[PDB]
Design a protein around this ligand. Structure first.
Ligand code: KW0
Length: 298
């Protein structure tokens, strides 16, 4: 290996992940309470948000093991089993979050731009179907990768999450390439969905047929682009560098490349978990009723 100094990396990762842990924990607990407590009835969007809250709660649950490993001595005291379990559950949660984000955007685009009257709220059915399908497929992929790693591989060690070349497991390289291309497709769908939502609300505000509360359309138009840009800044960096990460991880290379690649990936993961901790606060603020509840309570 090439052991370059990483005390500053350890400190920044520990503090960032601890802040993300506390913020995402409080955000996701309050979000779960407001999705099961004060929402006796659920809509498709509320179902998808509840599942994003669950996925993110599991990501904040994954965080403390990462902070322990990074702060203790940058050494992994537990077995290779727990290493692979946490390292796989984290990515499982991230890509479940991203798929559910895409699904919310798609339903908002079918609800806002093209819906003329309503849908008679028959949407919770296929909402629960799609959420259960995606969760089961994600459990399938997570267990597949964890069993293909724990037994088929020959390499286990006493340190975790560190940079390891995937020449020992090319299946993981191809799995990550598949995941990156599908994330870019999902983000293309999100960008189409939210751009079209903003444009439709902008034109409707431009006509302004009915004078009363015609400005709420401006607020919603800004909110569409806000959530698109937050998702764009919190995810596109990581998945844009991941192509270079895979390309470097499956060829002969010097170590100096390896330190910069590893530390870039650490910062990008800090960003990704930052999104997973923001999203509940985003739903708290963007909803009129919840924002009024918070403002009158605070
Ligand atoms: C329609 C098909 C969609 C397919 C996915 C279904 C939903 C998603 C379900 C769960 C993802 C499971 C984890 C996948 C891991 C991909 C990323 C990756 O390569 O992580 C590797 C793990 C180690 O895994 C064993 C080889 O990395 P770590 O060692 O935990 O961290 C190393 C490094 N810090 C890094 O993360 O690059």
């Amino acid at each position: 290996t090439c052991p370059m100094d990483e005390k500053l990396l350890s400190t920044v990762l520990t503090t960032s992940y601890s802040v993300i842990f506390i913020v995402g924990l409080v955000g996701n607990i309050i979000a779960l309470y407001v999705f099961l407590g004060i929402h006796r009835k659920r809509n498709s969007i509320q179902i998808y948000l509840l599942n994003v809250a669950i996925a993110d709660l599991l990501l904040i649950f994954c965080l403390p093991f990462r902070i322990m490993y990074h702060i203790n001595q940058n050494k992994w005291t537990l077995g290779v089993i727990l290493c692979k379990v946490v390292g796989t559950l984290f990515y499982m949660n991230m890509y479940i979050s991203i798929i559910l984000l895409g699904f919310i955007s798609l339903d908002r685009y079918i609800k806002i731009n093209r819906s003329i009257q309503q849908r008679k709220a028959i949407t919770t059915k296929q909402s629960i179907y799609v959420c259960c399908i995606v969760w089961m497929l994600a459990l399938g992929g997570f267990l597949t990768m964890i069993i293909l790693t724990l037994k088929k591989g020959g390499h286990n060690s006493t340190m975790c999450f560190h940079y390891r070349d995937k020449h020992n497991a090319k299946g993981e390289a191809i799995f990550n390439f598949i995941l990156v291309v599908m994330f870019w497709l999902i983000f293309l769908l999100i960008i189409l969905s939210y751009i079209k939502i903003g444009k439709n609300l902008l034109r409707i505000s431009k006509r302004r047929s009915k004078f009363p509360n015609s400005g709420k359309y401006a607020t919603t138009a800004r909110n569409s682009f806000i959530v698109l840009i937050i998702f764009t800044i919190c995810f596109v960096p990581y998945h844009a560098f991941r192509f270079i990460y895979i390309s470097s991880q499956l060829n002969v290379s010097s170590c100096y490349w390896k330190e910069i690649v590893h530390k870039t990936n650490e910062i990008m993961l800090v960003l990704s978990s930052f999104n997973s901790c923001l999203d509940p606060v985003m739903y708290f603020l963007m909803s009129s009723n919840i924002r009024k509840i918070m403002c009158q309570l605070l």
